[PDB]
Amino acid sequence: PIETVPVKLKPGMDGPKVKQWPLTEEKIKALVEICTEMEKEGKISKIGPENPYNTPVFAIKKKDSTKWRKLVDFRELNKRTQDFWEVQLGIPHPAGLKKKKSVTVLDVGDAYFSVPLDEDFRKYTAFTIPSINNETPGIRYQYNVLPQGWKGSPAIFQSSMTKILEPFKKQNPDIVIYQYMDDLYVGSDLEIGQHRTKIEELRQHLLRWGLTPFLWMGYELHPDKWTVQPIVLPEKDSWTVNDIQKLVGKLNWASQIYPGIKVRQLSKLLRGTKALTEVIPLTEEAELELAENREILKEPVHGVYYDPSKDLIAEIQKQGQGQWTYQIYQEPFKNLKTGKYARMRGAHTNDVKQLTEAVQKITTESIVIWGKTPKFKLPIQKETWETWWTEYWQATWIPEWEFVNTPPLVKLWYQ
Amino acid sequence: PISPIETVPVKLKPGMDGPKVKQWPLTEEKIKALVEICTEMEKEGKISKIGPENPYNTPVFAIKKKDSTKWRKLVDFRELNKRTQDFWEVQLGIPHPAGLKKKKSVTVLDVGDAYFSVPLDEDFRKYTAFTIPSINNETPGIRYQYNVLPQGWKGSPAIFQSSMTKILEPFKKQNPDIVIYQYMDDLYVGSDLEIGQHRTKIEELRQHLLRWGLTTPDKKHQKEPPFLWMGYELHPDKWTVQPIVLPEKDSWTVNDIQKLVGKLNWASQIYPGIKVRQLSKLLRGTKALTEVIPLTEEAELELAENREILKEPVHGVYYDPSKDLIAEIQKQGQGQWTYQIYQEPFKNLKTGKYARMRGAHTNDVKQLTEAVQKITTESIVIWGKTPKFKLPIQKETWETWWTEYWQATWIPEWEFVNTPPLVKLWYQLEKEPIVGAETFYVDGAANRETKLGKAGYVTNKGRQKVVPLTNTTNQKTELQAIYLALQDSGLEVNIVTNSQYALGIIQAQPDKSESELVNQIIEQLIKKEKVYLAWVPAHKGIGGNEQVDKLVS
DNA sequence: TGCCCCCCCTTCGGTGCTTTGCACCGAAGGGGGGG
Ligand SMILES: Nc1ccn([C@H]2C[C@H](O)[C@@H](COP(=O)(O)OP(=O)(O)OP(=O)(O)O)O2)c(=O)n1
Ligand SMILES: OC[C@H]1O[C@@](CO)(O[C@H]2O[C@H](CO)[C@@H](O)[C@H](O)[C@H]2O)[C@@H](O)[C@@H]1O
Ligand SMILES: [Ca+2]
């Protein structure tokens, strides 16, 4: 007896028509078991080829999780679904969530299955489960309730969500709660023991609605301990000709961000035509230029601030030895945040795992800090990334990415 | 009494009406054979005759079946297909025998007139109108509309293919001991039952399909091996492809070469070591489909090498899920790679080859990674898991590559196999400048209008050179200037350029390239013992960079 | 002189940085195969 919220597409756009990519045996077995149980419970229904729309589907396992989790690559549908900020169903972003000492993430996506979907919109949620060795043609399904991973599911359900959270937000007014896609970010400044206690209260607080992948898992963040990676000039005494050449190349690049950087008195040290390993002293005018340039790299970049109407963009640089640097920006050279990762899972043996782990780490930070997911510039070939990333993905969301190939002519973010 | 096959709702694209294409002239031999087949469809109820209220029409023709005495009726629905709604094809790929598991009982079935046994959408039959001449357009003739799925409509395969699954769905759930490979009307049914209990379930399936209007004639019913399935031959323990016909024509046209490479690619799934590089290299160019090409010395030898492979009959084995999958790749040279997938030694499940040349400058390590990725996708399609790899590359060679590459690259669980030729990096750039090596400050320049340019270097020991170049670009001179530094330097040399373009190519350690200049640079680097490359910005008064930029500009 | 799917090889035009040359890529047209 619940009326369905009518949903339209962006005018001038069709539905998603993305082909299903091959799936491993263990993921197909997980999906068939899940798509059979969801068919018994009427949450999904079989369709035919007359539905011209399709969206990829596969399964994942979250961190320290042993049971599979269905994940649908709704990236094409979300881009083509009407932005619910125009419908005013958008969720405001609390600027204090990044200031809490602890933030627990809860997968509340299972509650979306209780709300029906607009009938005229169900044809856009079509997906196809493949078969191993193409034994069976595509078994196509579509959604009848709010699907997990669609950007409209938390927007429609937010009206119901604000009611379920009312008693807990009033008994604990210092706890900040943010909702993004299937996740619920709960942040407090309490002790870790009292934080997890309030988290367990929030779980049992949701069970009181469940009676009237699962909710038991939670992942602890600490945004107050997040640090940034600035551009740094190395400290040396005996600079070789090649040392100053690399430094001048680095400073010249950095001048695109810090316009006060000068290199006139350092370039004149490279006046002659000397061997790369010849040690040269630092002139008096060059000593001040290097010291003055370090001070410019200390102060912040002028005029950098987050525009909520602009897309976030993230670049990543593979530095080797398990080191990975990244920068989040909206306009070029106006970086909102720079950082570095190290000793991630897969260090010194699997790059694709680390890059997949770093994309998840960056995306999680962008959700906590701005409530958005950035578009990634991944330092990897297209086929290399498309072959393995699904084997190491552990999140319920999937960011947008393009592929780049920029050799490191100037080691800029890491010495 | 047969249960109705539920009609699939079919629409046209918005704001589009049905087709009106009339009919092209047809020869009398075809017009006569058509009226006989159409009368058979009126008898069985597959085609209605009434349509004076129907302004639509689609052209019709007829070609014979493959090596059969029966003509096949086809309708050119290309105008209807443009105006019909889009379908999502449920056919995602082709089944392969190397993914089959051995069974004790096997049967092959084929539904008769399969498209004509599924009721078309009621409101859509008006747009399937078509005319046929009675006697050379002397009299008007018989008009008809399709009451079932026709042949030539873009939705006919997908509709029948999904409808076939709905009919088999209750049978497969109530018989989990059975495996059914459905591909259009072709049906492969295998089980580990007594082949008598198999014949029972097969007849149960024959009646169950006959309970929805799908006939299974005995002419297409295969009960005894070898089972001709998907263009293969299925024996109880092994499988092989149906025989391959190589055209032995002594005057090769472009279309002959295209047919040759196509059949070699098809045979390369089970016949190991098939090459098509030198043969397809004859095909490159803007030549017409009929131009005669003389086979080059390398292409004739490569064609002879393929003849030797296809002389001996080769077979594959079936998939045992209890054993691991093994994939072993061999380098064939000139960017060619073959591989075999097996579970027990010398018993290949299937073979294949990767000869794709992506990028203007590459090396064997990249091509091997691309080959591993092609195998991984293929294996997950066929068996749903990634095979253990046996690669002709040493662990130290791979570790040196992926740790130092700026891009993220990775190969799954793999072990080294000493099967020459081995894949290796032919040179490696030092990370730090070389003490005691001459430092070559290098630069080039070219005029955008005259296409003239100069390229040269200046070293710390006083050595200099400038060379004028004609019909050149800024990028070529920058490459040409590095080439001069490599030629006139000792075994160890430091090279400082300002060319981001040239430095990006060389730092990727290519061993092969489409550019004659890059290859000569590669040849020089392999001769060297220590090479250090460094980049500095231009027009900043740096070292010899300002000195050499003036000499070239 | 039809339809749908998969594969490889070559060509060609669009796209974005190596920049107005050069490189990459997806579409398309040739072939093979299946029903
Ligand atoms: N050149 C071809 C061959 C086949 N098919 C499609 C339409 C057929 O319905 C289906 C199955 O092919 P068959 O040769 O088995 O034809 P029917 O199954 O149509 O006839 P038969 O009684 O010979 O089995 O494949 C097609 O469109 N074009
Ligand atoms: O890796 C990109 C790859 O994915 C495809 C299909 O899987 O498209 C998906 O990814 C795109 C890149 O973000 C999205 O734009 C798109 O919505 C999503 O379906 C292919 O297009 C592409 O080859
Ligand atoms: Ca048939």
Amino acid at B315: H
Judged by CB atoms closer than 8 Å, whether chains meet at B408 and A355 is answered as yes
Length of chain B measured in residues: 553
Orientation angle between helical segments B297-311 and B254-267, nearest 10 degrees: 40
Would you call B435 an interface residue with chain A, using a CB distance cutoff of 8 Å?
yes
Per-residue CA distances from A1 to A4, A21, A117, B30 (Å) = 9, 38, 12, 62
B339 and B487 co-located in one domain: no
CB-proximal positions of chain C, under 7 Å: 1-12, 18-26, 30-35
Q: Is the CB of B151 under 7 A from strand C?
A: yes
CB B234 within 8 A of CB B123: no
| B285 nearest nt, CA–C1' | C10
Tell me how far apart the 2 most distant CA atoms of chain A are, in Å.
85
- Determine the Cα–Cα distance for residues B390 and A85; give it in Å rounded to an integer: 54
Of B225, B257, B279, the last residue of a domain is: B225
Judged by CB atoms closer than 8 Å, whether chains meet at B370 and A355 is answered as no
- Determine the Cα–Cα distance for residues B102 and B227; give it in Å rounded to an integer: 13
B307 and B338 co-located in one domain: no
Q: How far apart are the first and last CA of chain A?
A: 63
Half-sphere exposure of B127 (CA within 13 A, CB side): 24
* DSSP-assigned states of every residue in A71-97: EE-THHHHHHBPPTTTTT-PPPPPTTG
Q: Token pair of A98, please?
A: 């990044």
Of B225, B260, B280, the last residue of a domain is: B225
Q: Is the CB of B206 under 7 A from strand C?
A: no
User: Could you state, in order of their start, the residue ranges of all structural domains in chain A?
Assistant: 6-95+121-161, 96-120+162-220, 221-306, 307-415
In chain B, residues with a C-beta closer than 8 Å to the C-beta of A51 are 88
CB B430 within 8 A of CB B530: yes
- Determine the Cα–Cα distance for residues B210 and B187; give it in Å rounded to an integer: 14
Which structural domain range is residue B50 located in?
Answer: 1-90+116-156
In chain B, residues with a C-beta closer than 8 Å to the C-beta of A277 are 433-436
B422 and B338 co-located in one domain: yes
Identify the three-state secondary structure at position B158: helix
Cβ atoms < 10 Å from Cβ of A38:
19
B422 and B435 co-located in one domain: no
- Determine the Cα–Cα distance for residues B189 and A204; give it in Å rounded to an integer: 51
Element housing A25 (H / E): helix A25-40
Least Cα distance to A48 among B9, B92, B187 occurs for: B9
Identify the three-state secondary structure at position B190: strand
B100 and B4 co-located in one domain: no
B432 and B495 co-located in one domain: yes
| B12: β partners | B84
CB A344 within 8 A of CB A357: yes
B39 and B120 co-located in one domain: yes
Ligand with minimal distance to B75 CA: 1
B261 and B280 co-located in one domain: yes
B420 and B462 co-located in one domain: no
User: How many domains in chain B?
Assistant: 5
| A46: β partners | A141
In chain A, residues with a C-beta closer than 8 Å to the C-beta of B458 are 273
Angle at CA of residue A218, ends A213 and A223, nearest 5°: 135
Cβ atoms < 10 Å from Cβ of B219:
6
Considering just the CA atoms, what is the radius of gyration of chain B in Å? 32
- Determine the Cα–Cα distance for residues B61 and A222; give it in Å rounded to an integer: 72
B79 and B198 co-located in one domain: no
Identify the three-state secondary structure at position B14: coil
Least Cα distance to A22 among B94, B368, B410, B188 occurs for: B94
B108 and B136 co-located in one domain: no
- Determine the Cα–Cα distance for residues B415 and B391; give it in Å rounded to an integer: 6
Among left, alpha and beta (phi > 0; psi -120 to 50; other), residue B419 is beta
- What technique determined this structure? X-ray
Of B183, B207, B225, the last residue of a domain is: B225
Judged by CB atoms closer than 8 Å, whether chains meet at B85 and A52 is answered as yes
Q: Token pair of B527, please?
A: 């001769």
Q: Where are the alpha helices (DSSP H) in A255-399?
A: 264-267, 284-298, 351-370, 382-392
Nearest-10 Cα torsion for B263, B269, B272, B277: 50
DSSP single-letter state for residue A98: G
Half-sphere exposure of B533 (CA within 13 A, CB side): 27
B216 and B343 co-located in one domain: no
Identify the three-state secondary structure at position A9: strand
| B393: β partners | B423
Strands annotated E in B282-426 = 316-317, 326-333, 336-344, 347-354, 361-362, 388-391, 414-416
- Determine the Cα–Cα distance for residues A89 and A109; give it in Å rounded to an integer: 17
- Determine the Cα–Cα distance for residues B424 and B373; give it in Å rounded to an integer: 19
Angle at CA of residue B300, ends B295 and B306, nearest 5°: 130
Element housing A327 (H / E): strand A323-331
Only one residue has tokens 């024959």, namely: B206
Least Cα distance to B185 among B150, B219, B154, B209 occurs for: B209
Give the burial string for B535-552 (b: 16+ CB within 10 Å, else e): bbbeebbbbbbbbbbebb
Q: Token pair of A196, please?
A: 């997890």
Q: Token pair of A222, please?
A: 């600490």
Locate the chain A residue with the closest alpha carbon to B508: A407
Q: How far apart are the first and last CA of chain B?
A: 91
